[PDB]
Amino acid sequence: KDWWKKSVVYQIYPKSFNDSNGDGVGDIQGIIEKLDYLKELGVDVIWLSPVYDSPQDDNGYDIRDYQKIYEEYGDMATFDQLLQGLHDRDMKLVMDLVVNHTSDEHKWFEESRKSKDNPYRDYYFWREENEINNWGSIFSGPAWELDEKTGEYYLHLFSKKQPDLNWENPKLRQDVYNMMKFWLDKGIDGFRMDVINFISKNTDFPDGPVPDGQIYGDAGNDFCNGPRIHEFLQEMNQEVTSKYDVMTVGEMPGASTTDAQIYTNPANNEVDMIFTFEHMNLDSDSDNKWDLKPIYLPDLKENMSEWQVALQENGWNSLYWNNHDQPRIVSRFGNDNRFRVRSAKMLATCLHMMKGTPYIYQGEEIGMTNVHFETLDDYRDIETLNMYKERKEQGHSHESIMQSIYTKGRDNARTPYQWDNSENAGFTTGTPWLKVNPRYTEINNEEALKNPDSIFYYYQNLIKLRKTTEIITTGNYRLLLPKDEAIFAYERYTENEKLVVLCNFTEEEQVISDETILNEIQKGSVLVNNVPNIIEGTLRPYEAIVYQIKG
Amino acid sequence: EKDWWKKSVVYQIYPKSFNDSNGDGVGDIQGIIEKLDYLKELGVDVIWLSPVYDSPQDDNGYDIRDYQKIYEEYGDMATFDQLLQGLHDRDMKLVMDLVVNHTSDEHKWFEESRKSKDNPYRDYYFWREENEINNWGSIFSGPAWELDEKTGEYYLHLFSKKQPDLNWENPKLRQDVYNMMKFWLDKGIDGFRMDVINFISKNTDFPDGPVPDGQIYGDAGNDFCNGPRIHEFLQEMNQEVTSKYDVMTVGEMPGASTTDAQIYTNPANNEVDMIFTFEHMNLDSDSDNKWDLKPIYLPDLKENMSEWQVALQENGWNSLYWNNHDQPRIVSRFGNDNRFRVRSAKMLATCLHMMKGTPYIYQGEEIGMTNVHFETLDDYRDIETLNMYKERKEQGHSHESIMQSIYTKGRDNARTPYQWDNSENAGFTTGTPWLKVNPRYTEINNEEALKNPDSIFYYYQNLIKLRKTTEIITTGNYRLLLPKDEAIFAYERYTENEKLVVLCNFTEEEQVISDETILNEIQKGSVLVNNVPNIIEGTLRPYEAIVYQIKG
Amino acid sequence: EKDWWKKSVVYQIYPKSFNDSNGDGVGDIQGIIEKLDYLKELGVDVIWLSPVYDSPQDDNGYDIRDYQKIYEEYGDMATFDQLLQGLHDRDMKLVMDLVVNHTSDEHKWFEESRKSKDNPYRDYYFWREENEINNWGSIFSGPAWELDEKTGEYYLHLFSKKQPDLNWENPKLRQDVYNMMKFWLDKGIDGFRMDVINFISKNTDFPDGPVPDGQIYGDAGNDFCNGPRIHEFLQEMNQEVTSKYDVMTVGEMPGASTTDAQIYTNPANNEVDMIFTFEHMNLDSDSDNKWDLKPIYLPDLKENMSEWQVALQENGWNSLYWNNHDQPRIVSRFGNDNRFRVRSAKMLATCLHMMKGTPYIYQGEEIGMTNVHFETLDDYRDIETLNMYKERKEQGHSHESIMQSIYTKGRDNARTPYQWDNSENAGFTTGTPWLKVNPRYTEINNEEALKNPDSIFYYYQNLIKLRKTTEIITTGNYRLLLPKDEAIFAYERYTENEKLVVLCNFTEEEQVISDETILNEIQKGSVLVNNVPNIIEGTLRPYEAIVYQIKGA
């Protein structure tokens, strides 16, 4: 019952995990060969990013056939061996459910676009010129694309090759549910529902207000947090997910804590846990992630704490620092040179001692870092490449745009996993689809396993603690020292037990003077810590300590 | 008239950069229509329009997605038709590029070809298994063979990965090309420049070539360039298509021999009307690689240009050009582009236009547009330049030297927007140009040139007049004089009864002629055209050109 | 006022044919003075007076014998001065022709030039030995080179043998021209129309032109027209002369392109204020020869006039005209000069006057004077017509064909005396007119037009008033609508928050507009001016013109 509450999730980005056949792209057989490694790490759920047939405009999040394995990754037989190899090790597989949009090469759209009278016409959003609006695509340019075959425009929130599905159409909804049953019948263990709060559109498509110094209109709630999301999730649960023993994660940019309480209340049978972005958008000037601003620690703490408090009673949180859409955490919030190992362990402690299901992104467990290519042409992500063109046309300097890519680009997360110190870090024997970070000579899985002080062993130990330390699951959460600009301190608590978690987010020594904390830690024992020979009441540079107090 | 193209003067338009009429930053067909009276006033009678065909623009229109459709940014077919009729109304003609060595990978033929080994279009291109590819490199860097995961075979591309080569061994492909040509010729276009048309006969065994010391890729030689079937294919094309229309055909042929050119351009052979060669366009290089810079040595230039004059004078025909969309601008390359810009541009015009052949004026050449010098690669655009930068940087070449190679040879030198006036972006656009305008536009522009009677414009206008009125410019044979001189390019045009003696100083130093025979001719001749007033008999002042006519 | 000429309406007087006050049968200056009240009532503010300079009249005054002397038949300097002052007293202005491509052969400069090869004035003109002439033809037939037996050399004349071309390569000649200009500008004249001013820079090598099949003379190309020094000379003239006075300048430039005119008329270049072009006057011809007739095709006319609008709207300025002393009368040329004469004249006036530029009204246009059809060549007068007849007849054209060419394109169409009333010779003269009055004067005349409230006169009076009072007529940009339509000339004028939609039927056939964009626009507008009462919205009756004004917020 609710096995997913104590799970630790490891996210694999299959294009970049392990190439087993030398073509430069990771494949499913490459994953199968590392199952004993993941078992040794101690994770029990694998979230596999899309391996479905796709022309790869958005690296698999543009699906051309939901029930086919993309040929570069392998075949269905290889997928089945992966699923079986996981189950053989009492591990589980979660896949992405990508149903806000399809590839424009999906047969539904190939048909839809042919004629106003095609029976798939209303699977997508088609409008005449005078009925489009001023929305922009999340990947730059307008959100409406003209199709000369019918003279009408289709909606795409993401790329031109990712036309949005029309969830107002009940035949589309049932087709999606039948597709889900195909995978669930195979025995997969859950879905992450991608941008699932984007599926309820305002079909009037009104113009948005254009903010000062912008081109496109702010959609408000006209696609995000629309009125029918709960209805659709309930319908999906009744028709599909209620019939299987699976976990569901709702990826919902812009969903409030109030909304998330509804989504994750078990009595509503919508989703099991929420996946939010509020902690991923604080190091920006405005809503545009490319407009950089340094993180202010109290903002981070307040935001993460709000989510803890809002869902602790009967909701559930996904806990994560990074994934295939975010810069690598040790570079983003840690120090990625002199204190790379230490600050990576600090960040891991801070997240894993919260209430929720932790997500480890591939390579986080070995402290992989952001990448800094000198030129745009080593980058690959459509988002980055489109942003470059647009921000350049708006007058941002090359230097400025490259800085934004360095700090926020998704390719930071996608450079191939660094296995060893051989050519291309042992990821491939060919030429990788995206260059390996040259720091693989320092930062690699082989070196991490050889070094007992490595980030790997620390992650292995944190995962173990989640199995043996009940309060990590059962405790409520409370933020301490809310305004401190250097220390992230909080407690986990039940009636007769406490954890006090103390994390230095800076390279400067911090002396705790708060007398309540100093008296608590005197009666506690150290559960885990990242720097030996603790000076009680002090946090050395990037130090993390967790005290356990019983009573 | 019979062989009208012999006396024609061609003006080449690079449509992306000529004139933007709607403010999106790219040149368009309506922009060209607005300047037809300017072109007529210059006196050109043939416009060579670079590709406006539908294309994703990987190689700015030389990667064709639909041969019979106008690229939307340039206009629609109705606007194209207005350009053609507009030229015809002014007794001008339109020539376009025939780009049939390769298509875009987005062309429907390749879309079909790549699907499966049994697709009816499979052998429209060259598909090979891994152990059957060879070691050729692409002209735009990297290997000439690209893997397609759809079938697991590799396709050949001599140019970009998005320019798969067509298989001329396939007779159905040849007929489809011929039918496409008829589409255009039926509309009344006046000719074709047949692009790299000597690249279409491949050795389909694709053997490896020899890899020279310090290189990666094999030299193909005759296994794609000047293959055995070029004469056959040109004869076939002429019989099926071009013989049926009153049109001019130009064969673009890198590395063609004069021996084959004599055959190609003999009217009795019904192959092409004239040849477009490159003997004079890669001499300022260490060896075969244009990016390895070497200053021009004048006797090399003179030998090479003269060889082609002599080879084809009896019954063949040469295109005469200094520059185009593939070359640096001539005043910067071989002239002086500052204190003797106007004078040296006039010299260079004289030198070319007094040769035997059909002159080509590239847009902006007539106002002395110059090379461009951007600080960063970020302001460059050409796939060839961008791919070269990446390849040479990876091989260990210095950023500094790579940039100098771009400054001297980069194709974007030719592609910066035409400089119409001194208004913002030189009056090319009211928006943001697709490629930055050269900052010298405030001094170098069409308006200033039209206002100044001493400008390069009026000098070109006058050379065009002279070709119309001076028969020897067309009918004369050619001989090179002073072949070893490092400063003076001297040559003679001659008929049975009269001569021209053309004297051009390629240097900024005074050159006093010591050749007794030239001095005798100077003494008895009259001056036909000259670029510096008050000639000193027997002397060429810095960048001076003089043409003497002897008719006694 | 700043750039006053932008809002001016110019009325062109052809003085030989306007009004004879003394009874010798030729119009005169006192005759013009007598009509100042009439001209003011019409509302024009600039008079362009064709040449009244001393001239033997080989080309009716465009062959000048003395630039600073009034031709004695027209009056004296005192009478000229009275005309200038009389205009100024009514807040009206006087523009004259600057005729400096050529002079009369009776001009003192040429009388001196021709005397010997070493005369100080020799190089005021173009003299060549027989072996150094070329094959050009005169614009008025025959060769462009004339032998003078005094020296055995030939002189160049683009126009008549009595119009030798001035050599603008000579700086002494240029300064003499500038001093002459100052004589007139010091008297307070308000501007110059610079006649064929793009002919003044010759290719002094005088190359042969290509001779078309079935021809004798070589095409001159750009070897007298559009020479390299025109901009230079215009700048020099501007800085020495015209910049020192508050005057308007007009460049008459056959063959100058839109591109070239953008340069000439850009104020930053200090050349001329506006261009006067011919492209719309040369469309109803089979080729470059105006006498080879072809009916007008409306889309050609629309495209050409629109090209000039769009080309010059940003920085430059157009002269707007349908006719003058060199053209057939417009109601006959492009309108209907029978039952729909009044309606079609009003349509044509609307079409031109709602464009961007300075409108020119030719004398008699405002009462719908028409072309003339004399049965015999002996009633014609113009040197161009009489010379053409002889040349075309020797070339094999039939008498009947040549007469048709004269009826459609001859300049005397424009030169028959102005029709004042229904008295003898239409009240132009008590004597024998120099050129016969059009016999339609009994029905078409100024007095009838003033008495008739529906006349063409009141329509022109109102169009002139609209230009004074309706800002957008001056400030609006222009764009052509319905470009392919063979019957309707439709266009819009537009500013930030205002539009005019101009709809003119060039045919005798009813037209129903189906264009949704036009129909929607005109529903939002009000009628600014129209020539037929009881409009049916979206329909144009035969020769109907309607202008809608649409005001935004």
Ligand SMILES: OC[C@H]1O[C@@H](O)[C@H](O)[C@@H](O)[C@@H]1O
């Ligand atoms: O498909 C649009 C987006 O959907 C999100 O759920 C994925 O995490 C992104 O990687 C993707 O670009």
Ligand SMILES: OC[C@H]1O[C@@H](O)[C@H](O)[C@@H](O)[C@@H]1O
């Ligand atoms: O298409 C490959 C090449 O072909 C040549 O004919 C063109 O002039 C080049 O601009 C082009 O890059």
Ligand SMILES: OC[C@H]1O[C@@H](O)[C@H](O)[C@@H](O)[C@@H]1O
């Ligand atoms: O003098 C030659 C010509 O010059 C033009 O400017 C006049 O308008 C004509 O009437 C005249 O015949």
Ligand SMILES: [Cl-]
């Ligand atoms: Cl269908």
Ligand SMILES: [Cl-]
């Ligand atoms: Cl996109």
Ligand SMILES: [Cl-]
């Ligand atoms: Cl490429």
Ligand SMILES: [Cl-]
């Ligand atoms: Cl005469």
